[PDB]
């Protein structure tokens, strides 16, 4: 009995027990902001040399920082905030983390247990409020169960599909002292089924029949270090073209001839064409989101036909049962970690040397469907597509890892399209929820996770405005992030839809911007402004050469659509393509309708 | 039947129906931010001349602006945001509005009904998430019921205790066209009980026995235009001293000899002493919050004794049954609108000319308990208390209404203490939830509600950092707000508690500030910086004389406690008072413990 | 099992998916999961204060409920307290049997359909000792008019309501406790009783109680 009980925590406050459990969970970074209810915990971690504490200006900042940290590092991002508004301010990051499968462990202070349910000072029902945007949450009711709850939080956050959890910490609990022994298993952190094994064998047989296979790879492949390696091994062995989601960018080396780039609403028309014509689709850690599938009833016609004729279909490697057969029917569902299952899958897969006809089509499609756009003309503003290419080309020449975060909008899509993605966990972007303001704090979190990486925040002007106060946080944290604001002086993604669907009626989609150079100066951040084509190259070089936090503002062309585009309701291969003459006609129409204003 | 049905909306989109219903509800201002899901509504309100649209930089800004608008005007504050992150970003303002009884009507875009429950693009379960921080919410499921839901939202938000409501608007609903007639009652916006009448008579008899009455007035008295008038009439007739809550400031003219100022944790020791010794407490629209009562079991000993002896007690005028007998037992509960019930109450109350002994005590208490503090000394920094007094004195000399908003912290308490409050709805502060960052957007909302008022945001440096991006919003909205940042370069309220309870262990309570003058310049806002005593007067005058948005930074003394203070767990009359010698000893102790760092 | 039997006992539900109960355990599990399972300074002071209050009382009454039945020594200690300080005992419906009703100190059941003697006694008592009872609305009658003498005594610092309750949710839920003693009532009675002065006679109080019992039979 004495062997199974532990008394080593007796005499410690809940706050001190929190500190010890962070150590045992190998937490090296905490993002947070103090307040009355969480003071006993902050007193306990006072001048701790056991982890780095990062202070934002806003708790949403802490949340998105922790997300950026988590996605760069593969570790859970830990948040420590106070009760009431401190806790409700993390709701958007929690919802964000849920949608994008990010392991987030949020610790929120709470009013004393004696005051709960009285509409107390700074009391929010955060357990109730955060229920729909967490995998799991809990309120610790006494200090003896605090180690257990912390263990459960970290375990749930990092297993299955990773996601956010919240642990509510009443002030009197964290201030109270443990007076009793607790089960020693609570003071410590933590074979394939017959059914799945048969599914894998069946899936292998299906692929070995395929004449037009395609790999559809997503974020799930990034949740194991061997993920990208095994993805490549499968693609090489069976000779299979690979397309990825937005969140899967970097999982496959896009310089490889087998790369079909990104698929979806704003993905490559080559990738979209390929998946619509494939007879076997191998889904690796991707959830068939509605940005990817296009019109669902018209999605993957050839794979569905192949399935019905017993010569192909959809092979879904998925860890969460909830996302199996949720959107499309899987021909074979392989449940569990995709990387682990790939180890069993690949040796059953026949090695294939050549697919002449299939790859002939794929090469033809790639040739006719580049990410085309209207190039600069004499005197014109810098095109946002060209800017992204410039940054991508110059960044690649440093002997450092390059991590990209983004805001939400056109700049985000152009970043996805025109960067060349080659390494895992280098695209850190808000995809599921699509939170504007994500870019800057995520970059700070990623930079803290990877002190030797070049971290670039490709941001929109409207997105950057949402959370720009966190510039001071970057300086205080010593995070030499590189923010590039694509200043088109518009909410470009929304104006694109207003141009296309609402006859150029731009309803409240032009926010006024601050002077970004004076802003950067006020924040003690280096400032660079690029206003014309002739400054692009040297401006970007100064941007990347900087060894301090730096804000680059680039004046780019306005009212430029992101293309290709699969409009809502259309089949994935029913795309809008860039056309020089159509763009000019669009400009004329917009100019006339707005009386020359836009 | 034709008389009861209405076909006048047939042919309109849900968006257009939304626009029409705003008009019928006399909405003159909408605060919001666009996005994909809410586009059909934004298209409908495109270039509307029927109301002013105010665009923030962040949806939290929109929420707090609408709160500031609501509290300045007495009208509901209307918010219009998109799905997902647009909606989750308003959660803190909603929770804020619930705690402080603010009528907030939040309209949030939602993904099409066909996509709900699929983890769709930018889909949040906002109805689930906002359930605990709204009076009521709903998702509109078809356009025919949209007018009804809008009516219900406005009605619920503005009746009983006012509070926030949310209406979820699926994109396909707002885009769809009404093809059928709807009940004409849904196209249009909208006696005392025997039991209450007897309660009032009994309450009058109790007061007519009282020898030491006191009025404890709160926010509820402000929810009727005649509120302050009848409060004054009662106080005059029965000769009763009046104390108010933080949220009740301005309900009673503090220049009146009967004024006991604010009560509570940081309220006047005179007020706190008076309520602890009163034999009859008349609670007018106040909810006995834990910041006000002190130790609940030790609260109002004399009133409880009087009640038991049938010669006094607590008379609670309250509109919400949930807050009757929630914290303390009411001797008589008078349910309903306090102002309406005061009309029945006062004529039953005996007129009283003099209370020599009671008012002798009260005058003695007021004399011995001023808001004392350590004055400036040669070469010292400006004391924050002195700054507030300077602003209060100079602001009063303009022939304009003066409205004050605040952030959360020491500056907020000092603002409450050292302003002289004389007019209703002039203190607009986050009290229940206590949200830092509230000050600036609330000021913008209040300024929009009252274009001819002087609107002053008394802000802390940490609080201002939370939402400072909204400076550009003030400029774009043409709101000439006046922001005063009390820069003590600390989270002062938290450091006060760390000084007092945690032996001067300042754990992560010093955020780095931007250059506020360069910041103001970047935001196209006038900037003023006061650094020494000799600049205080002229600096504040320039601040108030400005006819444009202006940011005043004042360097004030650090590590200064807000006093008086009733520490948690102590009786309301068990207060800490300011003492010159104790402050000096505290300075010495702090200096030694921190090695001269603080 | 732990949650069901600790604090205030209550129901719990465990949902068992068919495929889970049919599936076979293929892995080791923490050995602590294969096995079933001091008074605070604050409560100790509350008990001392409660004892001092009772030692002043001239008209005490014990109001005992189901909570006293959740410990085998419950009834024994209830009797020991009643005997030592010479206190009449009334019980709730759910507390019936906790006290021997043949005892002269028994006031029978109180409440809506309880003894008028018990109801009269609690309305006139200056100190009410609530032992494992939750002041239900079948028991209190009109809440604002409940226990006038105990409330007066509390205000005058010579009595009030002493609430021995294990669940914080039921403390100060209905009526304000003069002293709240949190935890198992039986365990706290062991600390309480030795601080309570032994009393031989209460002539006037028990004269009234005997008069009330005489005039209010069922
Ligand atoms: C403006 C905008 C436009 C967009 N357009 C596009 C577009 O054109 N193309 C595009 O691709 N995206 C687009 N998106 C993003 C899109 O909404 C989704 O966020 C993204 O497609 C999801 O990619 P994912 O499925 O790979 O990642 P996730 O959403 O995280 O899904 C990962 C799946 O793999 C599972 N999984 C996780 N871990 C494992 C594991 N270890 N083993 C097995 N399975 C696992 C998860 O349970 C989940 O089912 C856009 C976003 C925005 C804001
Ligand atoms: C750092 C900090 C320190 C604070 N310290 C203090 C302090 O020392 N003193 C202080 O007073 N506050 C203090 N507070 C604020 C405190 O937390 C509460 O917000 C405030 O006391 C509530 O005041 P109120 O009851 O008047 O308003 P409310 O919280 O809005 O309560 C109003 C009550 O009146 C009712 N009501 C509403 N309308 C009507 C009507 N028409 N008719 C009848 N009834 C109606 C409502 O239902 C409600 O019950 C502090 C806040 C902060 C952030
Ligand atoms: C038609 C009808 C008429 C009724 N009229 C009457 C009436 O006239 N008189 C009457 O008495 N009842 C009456 N009732 C029953 C009444 O509604 C309640 O059920 C009953 O009064 C509750 O008694 P109780 O508080 O002792 O038990 P409970 O309801 O179980 O409350 C026990 C309290 O003690 C606490 N507790 C539990 N265990 C412990 C522990 N180990 N230590 C400390 N505290 C503990 C519990 O948390 C709880 O607060 C009537 C019921 C019906 C159906
Ligand atoms: C918090 C929030 N609000 C609203 C939206 C809706 N939204 C809005 C308003 C976009 C415009 C983005 O503007 P930007 O300047 O940041 O980027 P681009 O101009 O390059 O598109 S994109 C988008 O999805 C959102 N995604 N997040
Ligand atoms: C969003 C949020 N986070 C945390 C808190 C907790 N908190 C914090 C961190 C305060 C310090 C306020 O700093 P300030 O500079 O704005 O004002 P003062 O220095 O005058 O106190 S006050 C307070 O209640 C809060 N109220 N709101
Ligand atoms: C957060 O409030 C509560 O948790 C809280 C809420 C209700 C009752 C009691 C408490 S508390 O006593 O346990 N803690 C505080 O009151 N903290 C606090 N209050 C102020 C005014 C400023 C600061 C820095 N801290
Ligand atoms: C918000 O999303 C949905 O509501 C949504 C969600 C899931 C399915 C379908 C839709 S939608 O077809 O009805 N609307 C959009 O897709 N809007 C949109 N999308 C982008 C990428 C950029 C902009 C400006 N708007
Ligand atoms: K690319
Ligand atoms: K004052
Ligand atoms: Mg833009
Ligand atoms: Mg400060």
Structure tokens at B567: 């520490």
Has B523 been labeled as part of a binding site? no
Please judge whether C32 and A113 are an interchain contact, meaning their C-beta atoms are less than 8 angstroms apart: no
> Can you count the helices (H) and strands (E) in chain B?
24, 20
Q: Are C175 and C143 in contact (CB under 8 A)?
A: yes
Best to test chain A binding among B58, B59, B487, B505 (most A CBs inside 10 Å) = B58
Nearest CA distance, C58 vs chain A (angstrom)? 32
Concerning whether B122 is annotated as a catalytic residue, the answer is: yes
Identify the residue whose tokens are 């998109």.
B82
Please judge whether B308 and C144 are an interchain contact, meaning their C-beta atoms are less than 8 angstroms apart: no
Q: Is B342 left (phi over 0), alpha (psi -120 to 50) or beta?
A: alpha
Pocket of ligand 7 (CB under 6 A): A 290, 493-494, 497, 568; B 36-37, 83, 111-112, 115, 120-122, 171
Continuous segment of H or E residues that includes residue C171: none
Q: Are A84 and B290 in contact (CB under 8 A)?
A: no
- From CA A334, how far away is CA A342, in angstroms rounded? 10
Concerning whether B42 is annotated as a catalytic residue, the answer is: no
Identify residues whose C-beta is under 5 A from ligand 11, the ion: B 460-462, 488, 490, 492
- Burial label, B287 (beta-carbon count in 10 A; 0-12, 13-18, 19+): buried
| Residue B405, strand partner residues | B428, B457
Q: Considering only the beta carbons, identify the residue of A45, A512, A524 that sits closest to B472.
A: A512
Identify the residue whose tokens are 């650090």.
B558
| Residue A281, strand partner residues | A214, A314
C26 lines ligand 3 (CB under 6 A): no
Q: Which of B20, B59, B470, B553 is catalytic?
A: B59
Sort strands A213-217 and A136-139 into parallel, antiparallel or unpaired.
Answer: unpaired
What's the CATH class of domain A190-370? alpha beta
Q: Which of B574, B551, B575 is nearest to B561 (CA)?
A: B575
Q: Which of B493, B496, B523, B559 is catalytic?
A: B493
Q: Are A289 and A245 in contact (CB under 8 A)?
A: yes
Q: Where are the alpha helices (DSSP H) in B450-523?
A: 461-467, 471-477, 492-501, 516-522
- From CA B565, how far away is CA B578, in angstroms rounded? 9
Please judge whether A497 and B34 are an interchain contact, meaning their C-beta atoms are less than 8 angstroms apart: no
Structure tokens at B160: 């009983």
| Residue A459, strand partner residues | A485
Structure tokens at B477: 């909205």
Centre of ligand 5 to C-alpha A246, Å, is 38
Q: How was this structure determined?
A: X-ray
- From CA A217, how far away is CA A252, in angstroms rounded? 9
Please judge whether C33 and A185 are an interchain contact, meaning their C-beta atoms are less than 8 angstroms apart: yes
* Sign of the torsion angle spanned by Cα atoms A427, A220, A338, A75: positive
**From residue C57, how far is each of A326, A582, C125, C171 by CA, in Å?**
70, 95, 9, 22
At residue A203, φ and ψ (nearest 5 deg) are -65, -40
Best to test chain A binding among B43, B45, B129, B477 (most A CBs inside 10 Å) = B129
Q: Ligand 6: which atom is nearest the Cα of residue B496?
A: 24
| Chain C residues with CB within 8 Å of chain B CB | 144, 148, 151-152, 154-156, 176
| Residue B167, strand partner residues | B107, B138
Q: Whose CA is nearest to atom 22 of ligand 3?
A: C94
For a ligand 1 pocket test, name from A98, A270, A285 the mutation site with the most ligand atoms within 8 angstroms of its C-beta.
A285
- What lies within 8 Å, CB to CB, of A92 at 6+ separation is A60, A63, A433, A435, B85, B88, B89, B91
- From CA C46, how far away is CA A49, in angstroms rounded? 41
At residue A490, φ and ψ (nearest 5 deg) are -160, 160
Q: Whose CA is nearest to atom 42 of ligand 1?
A: A337
Please judge whether A55 and B290 are an interchain contact, meaning their C-beta atoms are less than 8 angstroms apart: no
Q: Which DSSP letter does residue B403 get?
A: E
Q: Which DSSP letter does residue B296 get?
A: G
Q: Considering only the beta carbons, identify the residue of C144, C148, C155 that sits closest to B304.
A: C155
Q: Are C120 and C216 in contact (CB under 8 A)?
A: yes
Q: In A480-513, which positions are buried (b, 16+ CB within 10 angstroms) versus exposed (e)?
A: bbbbbbbbbebbbbbbbbbbeebebbbbbbbbbb
For a ligand 2 pocket test, name from B156, B199, B222, B287 the mutation site with the most ligand atoms within 8 angstroms of its C-beta.
B287
Has B251 been labeled as part of a binding site? no
Nearest CA distance, A2 vs chain B (angstrom)? 35
Centre of ligand 5 to C-alpha B408, Å, is 5
Cα B181 → chain centroid = 42
Q: Where are the domains of chain B?
A: 1-189, 190-370, 371-598
Q: For residue A118, which residues of chain B lie inside 8 Å, CB to CB?
A: 290, 326-327
Continuous segment of H or E residues that includes residue B68: helix B59-73
For a ligand 4 pocket test, name from A93, A417, A436 the mutation site with the most ligand atoms within 8 angstroms of its C-beta.
A436
Question: Which of the following CATH numbers is that of domain B1-189: 3.40.50.2300, 3.30.1460.30, 3.40.50.970, 3.40.50.10490?
Answer: 3.40.50.970
- From CA A533, how far away is CA A496, in angstroms rounded? 24
Size of interface A-C (CB pairs under 8 A): 16
- Count the Cβ atoms, other than its own, within 10 Å of residue B193: 10
- What lies within 8 Å, CB to CB, of C28 at 6+ separation is none
Q: Tally the C-alpha atoms within 13 A of residue A54's C-alpha that lie toward its C-beta.
A: 37
Nearest CA distance, C38 vs chain A (angstrom)? 8
Q: For residue A114, which residues of chain C lie inside 8 Å, CB to CB?
A: 168
Please judge whether B55 and A501 are an interchain contact, meaning their C-beta atoms are less than 8 angstroms apart: no
Has B71 been labeled as part of a binding site? no
User: What is the CATH architecture assignment of C37-217?
Assistant: 3-Layer(aba) Sandwich (3.40)
Please judge whether B308 and C176 are an interchain contact, meaning their C-beta atoms are less than 8 angstroms apart: no
- Which residues in chain B precede a discontinuity of more than 2.5 Å between C and N? 190
Identify the residue whose tokens are 């970690």.
A337
C187 lines ligand 3 (CB under 6 A): no
Q: In B197-229, which positions are buried (b, 16+ CB within 10 angstroms) versus exposed (e)?
A: eebbeebbebbeebebbbbbbbbbbbbbeebbe
Structure tokens at B416: 């409450």
For a ligand 1 pocket test, name from A326, A431, A494, A561 the mutation site with the most ligand atoms within 8 angstroms of its C-beta.
A431
Sort strands A526-530 and C89-91 into parallel, antiparallel or unpaired.
Answer: unpaired
C8 lines ligand 3 (CB under 6 A): yes
**From residue B175, how far is each of A111, B44, C108 by CA, in Å?**
44, 10, 70
> Can you count the helices (H) and strands (E) in chain C?
9, 6
The angle that helices A146-158 and A14-24 make with each other, rounded to 10 degrees, is 40
Has A463 been labeled as part of a binding site? yes
Please judge whether C176 and B301 are an interchain contact, meaning their C-beta atoms are less than 8 angstroms apart: no
- Count the Cβ atoms, other than its own, within 10 Å of residue C13: 5
Q: Are A475 and A503 in contact (CB under 8 A)?
A: no
Cα Dmax for chain B: 84
Size of interface A-B (CB pairs under 8 A): 234
Centre of ligand 11 to C-alpha A514, Å, is 24
Has A245 been labeled as part of a binding site? yes
**From residue A265, how far is each of A67, B111, B367, B463 by CA, in Å?**
25, 16, 73, 40
Identify the residue whose tokens are 């029917």.
A329
Comparing alpha-carbon positions, the chain A residue that sits nearest to C170 is A114
Give CA torsion, residues A282, A285, A290, A294, to 10 deg: -20
Q: For residue B297, which residues of chain C lie inside 8 Å, CB to CB?
A: 176
- Count the Cβ atoms, other than its own, within 10 Å of residue B4: 9
Q: Which of B237, B211, B234, B244 is nearest to B312 (CA)?
A: B211
Centre of ligand 1 to C-alpha A192, Å, is 26
Q: Which DSSP letter does residue A523 get?
A: T
Question: Which of the following CATH numbers is that of domain A371-598: 3.30.300.130, 3.40.50.880, 3.40.50.300, 3.40.50.970?
Answer: 3.40.50.970
Structure tokens at A461: 């002007």
- From CA B361, how far away is CA B212, in angstroms rounded? 10
- Count the Cβ atoms, other than its own, within 10 Å of residue C90: 28
Comparing alpha-carbon positions, the chain B residue that sits nearest to A502 is B43
At residue B175, φ and ψ (nearest 5 deg) are -90, -25
A463 lines ligand 4 (CB under 6 A): yes
Resolution (angstroms) equals 2.1
Continuous segment of H or E residues that includes residue B105: strand B104-110
A92 lines ligand 4 (CB under 6 A): no
Comparing alpha-carbon positions, the chain C residue that sits nearest to B304 is C155
- What lies within 8 Å, CB to CB, of B560 at 6+ separation is B373, B374, B383, B384, B410, B488, B492
Q: Which of C102, C60, C109 is nearest to C81 (CA)?
A: C60
Q: Which DSSP letter does residue B347 get?
A: G
- What lies within 8 Å, CB to CB, of A330 at 6+ separation is A283, A313, A314, A315, A316, A318, A324
- For residue B564, say if its preceding peptide bond is cis, omega within 30 degrees of 0: yes
Structure tokens at C130: 């609530």
Cα A241 → chain centroid = 24
Edge-to-edge strand order for the sheet containing B104-110? B52-54, B29-32, B77-81, B104-110, B164-170, B136-139
- By annotation, the residues of A acting in catalysis are 59, 121-122, 171, 493
Please judge whether B39 and A476 are an interchain contact, meaning their C-beta atoms are less than 8 angstroms apart: no
Please judge whether A185 and C26 are an interchain contact, meaning their C-beta atoms are less than 8 angstroms apart: no
- Burial label, A350 (beta-carbon count in 10 A; 0-12, 13-18, 19+): exposed
């Amino acid at each position: 009995k004495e062997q199974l009980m532990d008394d080593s925590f007796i005499g410690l406050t809940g706050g001190e027990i929190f500190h010890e459990m962070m150590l045992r969970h190998k937490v090296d970074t905490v993002f947070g902001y103090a307040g009355g209810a969480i003071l006993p915990v902050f007193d306990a971690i006072y001048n701790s040399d056991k982890f780095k504490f990062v202070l934002p200006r806003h708790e949403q900042g802490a949340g998105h920082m922790a997300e950026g940290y988590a996605r760069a590092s593969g570790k859970p991002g830990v948040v420590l905030v106070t009760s009431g508004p401190g806790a409700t301010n993390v709701i958007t990051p929690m919802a964000d983390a849920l949608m994008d499968g990010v392991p987030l462990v949020v610790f929120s202070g709470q009013v004393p247990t004696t005051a709960i349910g009285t509409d107390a000072f700074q009391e929010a029902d955060i357990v109730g409020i955060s229920r729909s945007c967490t995998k799991w949450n809990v309120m610790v009711k006494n200090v003896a169960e605090l180690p257990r709850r912390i263990n459960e939080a970290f375990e749930i956050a990092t297993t299955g599909r990773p996601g956010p959890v919240l642990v509510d910490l009443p002030k009197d609990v964290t201030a109270s002292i443990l007076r009793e022994s607790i089960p020693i298993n609570t003071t410590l952190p933590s074979a394939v089924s017959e059914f799945t094994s048969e599914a894998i064998k069946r899936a292998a047989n299906i692929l070995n029949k395929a004449k037009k296979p395609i790999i559809y790879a997503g974020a799930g492949i990034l949740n194991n270090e061997q993920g990208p390696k095994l993805l490549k091994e499968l693609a090489d062995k069976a000779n299979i073209p690979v397309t990825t989601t937005l969140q899967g960018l970097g999982a496959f080396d896009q310089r490889d001839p087998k790369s079909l780039d990104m698929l979806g609403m704003h993905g490559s028309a080559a990738a979209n064409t390929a998946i619509q014509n494939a007879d076997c689709i191998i889904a690796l850690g991707a959830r068939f989101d509605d940005r990817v599938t296009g019109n669902i009833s018209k999605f993957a016609p050839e794979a569905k036909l192949a399935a019905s004729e017993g010569r192909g279909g959809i092979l879904h490697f998925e860890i969460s049962p909830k996302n199996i057969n949720k959107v499309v029917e899987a021909t074979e569902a392989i449940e569990g970690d995709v990387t682990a299952n790939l180890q069993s899958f690949i040796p059953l897969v026949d090695s294939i040397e050549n697919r002449p006809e299939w790859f002939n089509k794929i090469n033809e499609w790639k040739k006719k469907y580049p990410y085309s756009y209207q190039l600069e003309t004499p005197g014109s503003l810098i095109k946002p597509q060209t800017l992204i290419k410039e940054i991508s080309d110059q960044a690649q020449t440093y002997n450092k890892e390059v991590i990209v975060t983004t805001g939400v909008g056109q700049h985000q899509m152009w970043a996805a399209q025109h960067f060349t993605w080659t390494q895992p966990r280098t695209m850190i972007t808000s995809g599921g929820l699509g939170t504007m303001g994500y870019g800057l704090p995520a970059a700070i979190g990623a930079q803290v996770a990877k002190p030797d990486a070049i971290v670039i925040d490709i941001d929109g002007d409207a997105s950057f405005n949402m959370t720009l106060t966190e510039l001071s946080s970057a300086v205080q944290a010593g995070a030499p992030i590189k923010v590039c604001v694509l200043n088109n002086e518009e909410q470009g993604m929304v104006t694109q839809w207003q141009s296309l669907f609402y006859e150029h009626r731009y309803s409240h989609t032009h926010q006024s911007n601050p002077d970004f150079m004076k802003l950067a100066e006020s924040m003690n951040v280096k400032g660079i402004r690029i206003t014309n084509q002739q400054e692009l190259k040297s401006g970007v070089k100064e941007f990347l050469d900087a060894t301090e936090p730096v804000l680059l503002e680039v004046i780019v062309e306005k009212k430029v659509p992101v293309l290709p585009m699969v409009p809502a309701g259309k089949a994935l291969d029913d795309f809008i393509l860039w056309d020089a003459e159509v763009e000019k006609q669009q400009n004329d129409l917009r100019k006339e309708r707005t009386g020359g204003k836009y």
